[PDB]
Design a binder for this molecule. Structure first.
Ligand SMILES: CCCCCCCCCCCCCCCCCC(=O)OC[C@H](COP(=O)([O-])OCC(O)COP(=O)([O-])OC[C@@H](COC(=O)CCCCCCCCCCCCCCCCC)OC(=O)CCCCCCCCCCCCCCCCC)OC(=O)CCCCCCCCCCCCCCCCC
Ligand SMILES: CCCCCCCCCCCCCCCCCC(=O)O[C@@H](COC(=O)CCCCCCCCCCCCCCC)COP(=O)(O)OCC[N+](C)(C)C
Ligand SMILES: CCCCCCCCCCCCCCCCCC(=O)O[C@@H](COC(=O)CCCCCCCCCCCCCCC)COP(=O)(O)OCC[N+](C)(C)C
Ligand SMILES: CCCCCCCCCCCCCCCCCC(=O)O[C@@H](COC(=O)CCCCCCCCCCCCCCC)COP(=O)(O)OCC[N+](C)(C)C
Ligand SMILES: CCCCCCCCCCCCCCCCCCCC(=O)O[C@H](COC(=O)CCCCCCCCCCCCCC)COP(=O)(O)OCCN
Ligand SMILES: CCCCCCCCCCCCCCCCCCCC(=O)O[C@H](COC(=O)CCCCCCCCCCCCCC)COP(=O)(O)OCCN
Ligand SMILES: CCCCCCCCCCCC(=O)SCCNC(=O)CCNC(=O)[C@H](O)C(C)(C)COP(=O)(O)O
Lengths: 57, 44, 77, 83, 97, 127, 83, 111, 120, 536
């Protein structure tokens, strides 16, 4: 016979872990991890900086 | 000689099967030397 | 209730009696000895601290000597 | 040092880089170490027998360089007056 | 002492178990018991080997996708048979192969 | 037989325990041991700390004698009969940069003083 | 393994024969060492020989109490590690 | 003399009147020792044997105060070095008597 | 010499000294071949002074031999593996029976398992 | 392909240690060796691709393992020539040890858990060797440390084994703490944890000292060698892995990967550790202890050579790889001798009929240790001794260590085989299966291949030395071997006793350091929190 808590425990904790997974991966960039949003902008500033430093040399 | 005869009591340690065999320590050294001697003659 | 305080003497012939006891008094190091060893070991542990202090002192002394000489050269001239 | 001038360097930068010769091994014998290295790696297990000419040549060049180093040392020592 | 009723469910002493050695058979360990040798081991090992090969396949796929060789090998490497990102080999002199 | 060997069980405690009884490690087998062997009780080989110190006092000078000569008594010029390996200028300049390098001891070089000061570098980062 | 009395007796008797002074017919399964002619130093050597024969380590207090052929055999039979 | 209390099927009942002892959670409790219990009591209630003696004062001051002093001195040295490294003016620390009001560097300002 | 050795009577003390000396001969030897001459030498050493009757000289001999046997204690005693101080002593100790196992532990009053706060 | 080896070892660990109930003892005797064979095939491919054909590869598993503000590290594996060589050696030795454990551990209750720990141990060693950043190396360093703690203390009902494991854990904690400090210094002033950007031409002395202090832990050097001798409590397969490759080598590997060491310190510390280890091994009477002290001596040689020349790093790694094979062989053969004789003491060994393979493997491993000419150990040791001539101090000590090494090695060989039988007249036997023969075949194959393939590129390069100076290591080794066969006395009883007590480092720690530690704890607790600040 299954314990009283087994169903509730499995549903609640599985729901927590699944929700955490879906939020971490499903969410658009910059919603959960702020660095993900900055990556394209950093590439553009990197391009400008590279050109500028070359001119400086 | 007074005392226990330690060496007579332990005289079984000279058993043929409890002695040192050159072949066990150096199994194929003779074969290796014979092969080297043959090679020497060929190369020379 | 409580465990028995009676020992087992089944293996006393094979492994020896328990009559012999420890000679330790179960007391720790003397206070005088401890002060010496704490004030010896702890500086050894803090070796980086002394290296930093040494270098910093040398740097500050050099800088002060440089300033003093600069002042002297800037006074007459 | 001046009396015993360095030998000409046969190996160029491009060749030493192409043969992946570390900086430490670029010591006037780099061309020979390139030959030895290429032969040793070409024959992974048989280099000891096969690749013996290149090792000999490297060891000879190294010997000449060592003799130069000793000569330089003696000249410097005489200049300082110790011997 | 009369063995308890549950003792029928528990397994016997294995062949590898020394006859003198006594262990409690009721204790459960994930790594296995004192001397193991369960019935059906051959099937379990075959399943294990299959899971190992499947995971090796997945690991091989992942590695091949992530293995970045940025400098040409001196000579031919076995990776060329399976991975297409190997730079064309260049020898010590510099000649391309 | 590795498994199933007889063991002697440590007698149950039957007297008031000392305050620092935590220094004794007893798993229930008869030969209990101190937390650190040699902290108290029988010492291995009947050798005290004083004996070990006297030994180290006898040994230390003989062991240190080779090292003290070359490191302190000897000098760069006299340590070896040759100069450090000679390299082309481009290679040598780069190699001289390494503090833990072997080209910094070339007295013949006109940059010896700078190289020697580089070798005896900073004890700790200035910044 | 609980070694049987007969085997232990035969091997203790075998060991005791080695003393030169002892007469090969006086040593019986139940004989004191004094009657056999063994001194105190001899008894120590005999106990040590017993230690070699059965591959055990006798604690010194028990070894002191061994002074007759009977008690030795009993002690070995009692010991579970005797080989 | 013993019986299985637990029932997997769920039809568990405590036979409080059973002659035979139930194999409940209490079966596996470890037997205590009169001397070990008194040792535990003595160890916990060690404040009773505390006595103010010169040796106790010496030991406390030398290790606790000594460590605290060493730690404060090191932290003060590190703060002084950082101030010199950063180029900031000598900061007004709490116990330092400095005729300067500098505490937090201005982010806008270039030091 | 330890207290237990000292309490022993003269005869037992000399027997113990002989035993310990033989064991130390074994420990310091490199093979069984070395043991036999050394053991005969030890026997002769004890036999030489056995007939001494002067109590003072006997005490001097005993004390000196005890100091020698204390100094020459080996760092590594040669002990059989299965005995105390041996490598295989306690490796897999034989389990005693009468082990208290609680069957079906989670199914004993499953709903009410937990800690309670009792108040007055 | 490169990842596969680590996968196989971690799989074998998870399978044996989590699913051993299903697999069984026989299942672990299959899955372990099978996985290790597959890992050997992968390691061989890696070695050929990277070492022989100069093709380094970087595999980044995932990015942002740690992403707090500026600090950013990724789980990446770079297989460089050092990594390939060490991977190959480690996997070869582990495969042999796994084959060996099938018969040796049959008499042990948890053979599944033992095999699991051995495979996890090998996996963490491969993680340490192949890491591309300092964090991955730390992950491997700690994983081997934990696996050693779980393997030395395998016999829990022995107080000595648990104490030996605690000793290992504490010493390794002190060392990894110094390493963490050095890694923080290197990250702060270079901007990255990757070895490519880690390069610094001039480093402050503090970082060098911290690096050395971190390395001397795993590679048991002087003052930090206490745990190695004690680590003999564990089963023989553990000792072979730790001593031959997994643990002792890590310190050298770290020093060679990042050349931040100082010449003055490494040379003196190494030569001292070589001499002390040889002297300690002279006194030792346990077979397994003598081979541990031999390991200490060899580690001293490898540490010392770094000071001599630029090629010292190559010479050290070459000795490390040559040493792992013969040393593993010595431990496995010692274990089999102990198992067959039920004895750990050199006094009770003697000539007895046995297997030809085991006796030959022991002789050849001992010869490699001794320095017999035209052997892998000889070339790797002469490369060190010949190149150390420039440092007069290091050379003299290392030659003396060569003498002592030869003396104890010859004494051990004489005692185990030439000497007459020394054990009792009792029935003892250990029958060797074909798996053990395969294990010795693998070790002998490694030993043979090492002679043909070599250990360093500069191994046979000429050292411009007079003939008398070049061939002296041989004369010193021969003299020591001859003196060892004669079983002559070299030192007075006072020094023999001193060397048996290992210099009294542990007696110092117990009488002074441990007493101070527990007095600080007494002042901190009894006097203060539970005394002055506790209410009546
Ligand atoms: C550091 C150096 C080494 C540290 C100590 C070395 C020597 C210490 C010397 C001092 C000493 O001996 O103290 C013992 C003494 C207690 O006597 P006793 O012999 O233990 O037994 C008497 C009781 O019956 C005992 O009966 P009891 O057992 O039932 O009571 C025990 C009680 C007794 O405890 C107390 O009564 C005082 C407890 C704290 C004392 C505060 C500082 C004392 C020492 C600090 C500086 C020492 C340098 C010298 O302990 C407690 O339970 C209370 C502690 C719980 C609170 C924890 C807060 C800790 C604060 C500071 C900790 C002390 C520093 C060490 C750790 C360092 C960390 C920073 O404590 C004091 O008398 C306090 C001394 C100073 C108090 C602060 C100044 C009071 C301000 C009053 C101003 C007057 C106002 C005027 C208006 C009045 C009208 C309202
Ligand atoms: C009671 C237990 C019984 C069951 C046991 C379970 C067995 C578990 C198996 C162990 C897992 C080992 C795999 C370790 C890698 C972790 C997998 C992972 O994290 O997935 C990564 C994908 O990466 C991988 O898949 C790695 C490949 C795994 C297998 C490759 C080789 C296997 C050998 C193991 C060596 C791994 C060393 C790594 C050390 C850090 C996620 O990708 P990202 O999107 O980049 O995630 C962001 C990163 N971060 C987590 C930091 C937020
Ligand atoms: C990094 C990428 C992949 C990571 C894989 C890591 C390898 C496997 C990790 C499995 C889980 C990690 C920790 C497991 C739980 C820790 C407990 C344990 O390891 O052993 C348990 C029991 O072991 C288990 O049941 C589970 C072990 C399964 C696999 C363990 C492999 C080795 C652990 C790896 C170390 C973890 C690394 C943590 C730090 C890096 C206790 O063993 P003992 O104390 O020695 O007592 C056993 C009885 N006897 C006296 C007879 C020895
Ligand atoms: C001077 C220090 C220079 C280097 C420092 C590295 C090590 C210093 C001391 C090493 C202690 C670690 C050894 C250990 O943990 O093992 C003990 C465990 O001991 C303890 O846990 C006691 C605590 C000691 C740990 C720390 C004490 C020393 C602290 C150093 C300085 C004290 C304070 C300084 C700053 C806090 C077991 O003892 P053994 O009997 O020898 O076990 C070996 C196995 N066999 C039975 C076969 C012999
Ligand atoms: C090759 C590199 C060097 C490797 C190791 C070198 C170690 C050399 C240091 C020892 C040489 C100098 C020793 C100091 C002079 C002492 C002379 C006699 C000693 C003495 O009388 O008291 C001893 C103090 O312990 C002591 O002597 C402890 C002082 C040691 C200083 C700390 C150095 C670390 C030592 C680690 C290994 C040394 C092991 C042996 C010291 C024993 O004191 P007690 O316990 O009997 O007092 C009673 C308890 N109330
Ligand atoms: C009643 C309660 C107290 C009674 C007993 C107290 C006895 C303790 C007295 C000595 C304790 C340790 C000594 C530290 C203070 C020494 C004198 C303080 C004055 C001072 O700051 O001088 C600095 C000391 O060096 C330093 O910066 C610190 C050096 C010592 C720290 C390392 C020693 C042990 C390491 C263990 C770890 C502890 C620290 C961990 C971070 C160097 O002068 P300055 O150049 O700074 O000029 C600053 C202007 N005076
Ligand atoms: C590894 C180095 C080895 C260590 C060697 C150290 C050993 C020291 C050797 C010197 C010690 C002695 O001489 S200690 C000898 C002391 N001399 C005496 O006691 C004279 C009186 N003799 C008696 O009481 C009995 O004859 C008795 C002898 C008891 C026998 O009893 P039995 O009549 O029933 O056999």
């Amino acid at each position: 016979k299954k314990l009283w808590l087994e169903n509730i425990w499995n549903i609640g904790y599985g729901g927590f872990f699944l929700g955490a997974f879906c939020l971490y991966y499903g969410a658009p960039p910059g919603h959960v991890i702020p660095s993900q949003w900055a990556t394209p902008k950093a590439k553009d500033e990197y391009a400008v900086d590279m050109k500028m430093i070359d001119k400086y040399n | 000689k007074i005392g226990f005869q330690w060496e007579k009591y332990e005289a079984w340690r000279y058993h043929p099967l409890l002695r040192f065999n050159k072949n066990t320590m150096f199994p194929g050294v003779g074969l290796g030397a014979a092969a080297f001697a043959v090679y020497y003659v060929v190369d020379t | 209730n409580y465990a028995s305080l009676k020992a087992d003497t089944s293996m006393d012939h094979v492994f020896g009696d328990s009559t012999n006891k420890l000679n330790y008094d179960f007391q720790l190091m003397s206070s005088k000895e401890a002060f010496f060893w704490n004030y010896t070991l702890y500086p050894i542990v803090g070796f980086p601290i002394f290296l930093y202090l040494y270098q910093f002192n040398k740097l500050e002394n050099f800088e002060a000597e440089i300033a003093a000489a600069k002042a002297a050269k800037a006074a007459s001239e | 040092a001046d009396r015993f001038p360095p030998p000409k360097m046969v190996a160029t930068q491009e060749e030493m880089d192409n043969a992946d010769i570390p900086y430490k091994y670029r010591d006037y014998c780099a061309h020979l170490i390139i030959d030895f290295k290429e032969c040793r790696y070409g024959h992974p297990l048989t280099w000891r027998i096969n690749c013996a000419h290149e090792l000999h040549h490297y060891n000879k060049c190294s010997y000449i360089e060592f003799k130069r180093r000793v000569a330089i040392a003696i000249e410097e020592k005489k200049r300082r007056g110790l011997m | 002492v009369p063995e308890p009723p549950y003792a029928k469910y528990l397994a016997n002493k294995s062949h590898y178990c020394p006859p003198d050695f006594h262990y409690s058979r009721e204790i459960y360990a994930p790594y296995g018991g004192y001397f193991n040798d369960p019935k059906g081991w051959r099937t379990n090992t075959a399943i294990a080997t299959l899971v190992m090969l499947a995971g090796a396949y997945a690991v091989f796929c992942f590695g091949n996708a992530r293995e970045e060789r940025l400098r040409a090998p001196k000579g031919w490497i076995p990776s060329q048979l399976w991975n297409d990102n190997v730079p064309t080999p260049v020898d010590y002199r510099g000649k391309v192969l | 037989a590795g498994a199933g060997g007889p063991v002697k069980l440590s007698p149950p405690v039957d007297k008031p325990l000392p305050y620092n009884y935590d220094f004794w490690m007893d798993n229930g087998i008869y030969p209990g041991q101190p937390i650190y062997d040699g902290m108290f009780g029988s010492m291995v080989g009947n050798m005290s700390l004083e004996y070990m110190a006297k030994g180290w006092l006898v040994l230390l000078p003989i062991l240190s004698a080779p090292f003290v000569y070359e490191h302190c008594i000897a000098d760069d010029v006299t340590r070896n009969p040759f100069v450090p390996r000679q390299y082309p200028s481009e290679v040598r300049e780069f190699l001289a940069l390494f503090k833990n390098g072997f080209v910094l001891n070339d007295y013949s070089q006109p940059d010896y003083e700078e190289m020697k000061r580089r070798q005896s570098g900073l004890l700790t980062p200035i910044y | 393994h609980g070694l049987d009395r007969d085997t232990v007796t035969e091997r203790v008797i075998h060991v005791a024969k080695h003393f030169e002074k002892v007469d090969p017919n006086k040593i019986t399964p139940t004989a004191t060492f004094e009657e056999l002619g063994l001194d105190s130093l001899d008894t120590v050597e005999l106990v040590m020989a017993l230690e070699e024969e059965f591959g055990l380590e006798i604690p010194d207090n028990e070894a002191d109490k061994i002074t007759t052929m009977a008690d030795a055999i009993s002690y070995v039979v009692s010991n579970p590690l005797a080989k | 003399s013993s019986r299985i209390a637990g029932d997997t099927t769920g039809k568990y009942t405590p036979n409080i009147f059973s002659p035979e002892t139930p194999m409940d959670r209490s079966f596996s409790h470890v037997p205590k020792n009169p001397f070990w219990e008194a040792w535990v009591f003595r160890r916990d209630n060690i404040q009773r044997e505390f006595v103010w003696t010169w040796q106790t004062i010496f030991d406390l001051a030398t290790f606790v105060g000594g460590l605290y002093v060493a730690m404060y001195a090191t932290a003060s040295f590190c703060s002084r070095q950082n101030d010199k490294r950063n180029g900031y003016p000598e900061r007004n620390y709490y116990f330092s008597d400095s005729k300067s009001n500098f505490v937090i560097p201005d982010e806008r300002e270039f030091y | 010499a330890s207290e237990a050795v000292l309490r022993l009577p003269h005869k037992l003390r000399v027997m113990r000294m002989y035993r310990t000396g033989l064991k130390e001969i074994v420990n310091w030897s490199y093979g069984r071949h070395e043991f036999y001459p050394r053991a005969n030498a030890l026997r002769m050493e004890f036999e030489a002074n056995k007939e001494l009757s002067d109590r003072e000289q006997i005490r001097k001999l005993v004390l000196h031999g005890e100091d020698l046997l204390a100094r020459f204690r080996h760092w590594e005693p040669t002990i059989r593996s299965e005995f105390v101080g041996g490598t295989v002593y306690g490796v897999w100790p034989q389990h005693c029976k009468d082990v208290k196992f609680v069957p079906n532990p989670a199914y004993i009053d499953e709903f009410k398992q937990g800690d309670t706060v009792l108040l007055y | 392909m490169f990842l596969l080896a680590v996968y196989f070892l971690f799989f074998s660990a998870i399978a044996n240690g989590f699913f051993g109930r299903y697999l069984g003892v026989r299942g672990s005797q299959l899955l372990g060796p099978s996985a290790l064979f597959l890992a050997l095939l992968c390691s061989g491919t890696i070695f050929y691709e990277v070492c022989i054909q100069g093709c380094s590869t970087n595999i980044k598993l995932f990015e942002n393992f740690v992403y707090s503000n500026e600090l950013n590290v990724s789980a990446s594996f770079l297989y460089d020539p050092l990594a390939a060589t060490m991977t190959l050696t480690v996997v070869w030795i582990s495969c042999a040890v796994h084959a060996y454990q099938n018969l040796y551990m049959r008499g042990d209750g948890s053979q599944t858990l033992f095999t699991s720990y051995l495979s996890a141990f090998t996996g963490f060693m491969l993680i340490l060797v192949a890491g591309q950043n300092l964090v991955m190396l730390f992950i491997g360093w700690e994983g081997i440390g934990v696996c050693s703690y779980l393997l030395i203390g395998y016999y829990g009902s022995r107080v000595s084994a648990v104490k030996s494991a605690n000793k290992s854990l504490i010493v390794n904690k002190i060392s990894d703490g110094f390493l963490l400090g050095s890694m923080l210094y290197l990250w702060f002033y270079t901007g990255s944890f990757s070895y490519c950007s880690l390069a610094t031409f001039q480093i402050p002395d503090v970082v060098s000292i911290l690096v050395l202090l971190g390395a001397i832990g795993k590679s048991s050097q002087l003052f930090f060698h206490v745990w190695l001798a004690d680590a003999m409590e564990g089963p023989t397969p553990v000792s072979a892995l730790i001593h031959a490759a997994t643990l002792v080598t890590a310190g050298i590997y770290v020093l060679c990967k990042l050349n931040l060491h100082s010449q003055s310190a490494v040379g003196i510390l190494g030569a001292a550790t070589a001499l002390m280890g040889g002297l300690f091994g002279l006194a030792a009477n346990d077979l397994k202890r003598v081979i541990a002290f031999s390991t200490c001596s060899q580690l001293g040689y490898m540490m010392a050579v770094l000071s001599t020349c630029d090629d010292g790093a190559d010479f050290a790694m070459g000795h490390l790889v040559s040493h792992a094979g013969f040393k593993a062989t010595l431990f496995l053969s010692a274990g089999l001798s102990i198992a067959k004789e039920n004895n750990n003491f050199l006094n009770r060994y003697g000539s007895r009929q046995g297997s030809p393979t085991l006796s030959f493997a022991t002789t050849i491993a001992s010869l490699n240790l001794l320095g017999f000419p035209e052997l892998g150990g000889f070339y790797s040791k002469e490369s060190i001794l010949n190149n150390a001539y420039i440092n007069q101090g290091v050379s003299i000590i290392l030659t003396l260590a060569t003498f002592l090494t030869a003396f104890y090695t010859s004494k051990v060989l004489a005692q185990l085989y030439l000497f007459p039988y020394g054990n009792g007249r009792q029935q003892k036997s250990f029958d060797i299966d074909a798996t053990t023969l395969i294990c010795f075949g693998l070790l002998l194959s490694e030993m043979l291949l090492r002679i043909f393939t070599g250990s360093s590129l500069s191994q046979n390069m000429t050292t411009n030395l007079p003939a008398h100076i070049k061939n002296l290591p041989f004369w010193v080794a021969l003299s020591g071997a001859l003196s060892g066969l004669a079983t002559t006395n070299l030192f007075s009883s006072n020094f023999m006793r001193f060397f048996g007590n290992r210099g009294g480092f542990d007696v110092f720690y117990a009488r002074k350091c441990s007493n101070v530690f527990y007095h600080n704890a007494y002042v901190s607790y009894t006097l203060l929190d539970r005394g002055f600040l506790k209410l009546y």
